[model samples]
Target chain A: MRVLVVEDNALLRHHLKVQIQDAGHQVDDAEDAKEADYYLNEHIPDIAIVDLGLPDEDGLSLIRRWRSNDVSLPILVLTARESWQDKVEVLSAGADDYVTKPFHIEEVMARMQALMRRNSQ
Target chain B: MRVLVVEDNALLRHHLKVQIQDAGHQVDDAEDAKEADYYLNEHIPDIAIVDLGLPDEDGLSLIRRWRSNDVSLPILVLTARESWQDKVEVLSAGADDYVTKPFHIEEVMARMQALMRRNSQ
Candidate 1:
């Protein structure tokens, strides 16, 4: 599966790319919403793992924009805030799932798989 | 916090009750939808952990019924199915969150806490 990872943190972005690749999937990454939009416009991946905080815009806005434009790829959010309100907001904004920051890569993979499985059928 | 645990399996139900109590919460448990309804009618708990397959009724119906009747407590579903459609159905039925069956106790605790935190505010 092809996966888009949107994250600003250099180390984490690289880490996710490596982990996702190691999991036998293709990884396309972006540092912020602009780059993400560029890649998204070029081609939508099978699934996406988005960080809530971005340098250019809040991730929530990106999600809303994607959904508004009818980009139906499954999205999984990565958030630092543990508030339920934040979770609800993301989900309501069209994200399929989310993982709190300080998460295990296994959790991210699991959620991604679940979202893709849901979208597959 | 007081929690309601609804599961048909006796062993799992007892295990959940013990685990919740160990986490310093009071628990009221039921084996099926009828008992769950009976408990809910008597008093609402802070949150609920419900199993999807029940003897008398599917857990989704229970969630829908509770929402229709305006029972607003946070609900976390315990599901054996991994399909995204099933997840969406439960969420649409008004469950706040869910955990797939055979989950670690820690994962269940984390999801429950997240749901409660969301509802708390």
Candidate 2:
């Protein structure tokens, strides 16, 4: 499986990339939505971990763009917002799953796997 | 198993009512959030299928209400959105599952059963 990490925070992105790679899947990194799109065109990702607070455009729009373009890839959102209201908005928009900022690594991996399983089927 | 469906669309409501009843589970229907709340107060539903675009409140908000109240009832958001955006939000909003519009009855039934099994454990 290939997992793409789209995050601007250097330290956190490094941690996520290493963790995902350690889990045995290839890891790709993008700092913003523009880089993500350009990268995605070259190699498709089986799973995506997106941060809604992107530099160019809201990460939410990136998801919209993916779905609008007929890409059925599963995405798991990682955000600092804990409000159920914000959570609902993201789920309603198009994300396959999500985890709050202060989340367990295992929880993130499990949710991402669940979405990938469902979408791939 | 008992399943509550909250959808205002007369056609979809009627269809889901028949389908759920045909599947051998006790079913309840509410056209809006208020009515759903009233029904919920009368009897706690084992699983809830909420429509996000409710007349009084979005299905996401209703799910939030249940979460804030610490209602352990499992929820499955029913919406017409195709965004990973919306799907992620529902999962984060405290719903155990979600199904988009033009759904397969089996998909909802399976997911509900899966949550039921997990929660009941």
Candidate 3:
């Protein structure tokens, strides 16, 4: 499955790319929401890995925009906050899943695969 | 869709991975047949892009093995050699299609999509 990694952290972004590739999938990445939007405009990936803490626009808003535009691809949100309220907010904002920071890439990929599997259904 | 790329050329493999991702497909890669086989044994990708020449095993043999094992996913072969006989040989070896080296990534993607569409039909 193809995935879009929307993150502001360059190191984590690179790591995500390598991890996803190692797990046997293609990946596209954006350092911020603007570039993420640009990619979304031109191509539709199977899923997206979004970070809520953006250098520019909020990731929640990005998810909302994609959803409002009828982009049905699965979205997995990443955030540093572990508050249940934040988790609820992220899910309510149209993200399919949420991953807290300091998380494992394996968990991310597994969630991605599960989401895609459900999407296919 | 998920794609497996089996190519020995590092630059081309990486380029293919990036372009395929940009085209909104998941891609996995192996530098040689042994690594490719390892991936195939554990995970099933939607399609595969294979190189005809490898340091370890022939890509043709890889395709044949996959076919004989009933790995029904679409297979796209890549070759630096340009000859009618080579093309014929590749297709006859059970490749779903073939891409010559010096080919555009766009063309590779188009052909892959075309093959995928036809296969679904």
Candidate 4:
């Protein structure tokens, strides 16, 4: 599976890239919405893990834009926000699922796998 | 939150009941579709955890029935099955989320919380 990771935190981005590679998948990463859009234009990945906060734009807007353009790949939001409203907003914006911050990489991988499985069906 | 737990496995049902109670929620437990129906007819729960393989009927049918009758409570499936098709089917039948068997209770709680959060909006 090919995965796109859109996060601005260099440490977390590198960690996700390494972990996803270790899980035997290809990864294309971006630091912000602009870079993420560039990667998407190049190729739609099997799935995406996007952060809610980005340097250039809010990831919610990016997700909304992707859905508006018919980029139907599975999207899982990685967010630090704890409000239920935030979660509802993201799913309403077309994200398949989300994981709150301070998460285990294993949990993130599990959600990714679940989203991919659901998308495939 | 008031939660309804429907599972045939005595041990797992007891375990989930205890854990949910420990999490500061009230619980109603049922061993099969009939009992679950009885509970639902008596009073609607805030959320439900349903096992897929019920003694009297498949939980999928129960979920379909609930949705058809406009039961809008968040439902989280507990299943030993690992097929993506099953996941897709359950989601299509109106389950809010699912957790596979041999799962940590913490993960189940987290998913339940997530489903509740999503359902609130």
Per-prediction fnat: 0.00, 0.00, 0.00, 0.00
My TM-score estimates for the predictions, one after another, are 0.57, 0.54, 0.49, 0.58
Instruction: Give model 2's docking category.
Output: incorrect
Q: For residues A1-121, write the lDDT of model 1, one tens digit per residue.
A: 8899999998999999999999899889999999999888787799888998998788999999998898877778888977666776677667766678887666566566645543553
Residue B35 displacement (Å), model 3 = 46
Query: Candidate order by TM-score, highest to lowest?
Result: 4, 1, 2, 3
Q: For model 3, what is the error of residue A87's alpha carbon versus the real structure, in angstroms, after optimal superposition? A: 0.7
Model 4 spans > 4 angstroms off: B1-121
Give the top-scoring candidate (TM-score).
Answer: 4
Worst 10 residues of 2 chain A by lDDT: A112-121
The digit string of per-residue lDDT tens for model 2 on A53-73 reads 988888889988898788767
Give the TM-score of candidate 1 (chain A). 0.95
Per-prediction interface RMSD in Å = 9.9, 10.8, 18.7, 8.9
Candidate 2 residue runs with Cα over 4 Å from true position: B1-121
The DockQ figures for the candidates are: 0.06, 0.05, 0.01, 0.07
CAPRI-style quality class for the chain A–B interface of candidate 3: incorrect
Residue-by-residue lDDT tens digits, candidate 1, B10-117: 999999999999999989999999999888878789999999999889899998988888887777889797666677667656776667777767656766665554
| Number of clashes recorded per candidate | 0, 20, 2, 0
The true-versus-predicted C-alpha distance at residue A47 of model 3, in Å, is: 0.2
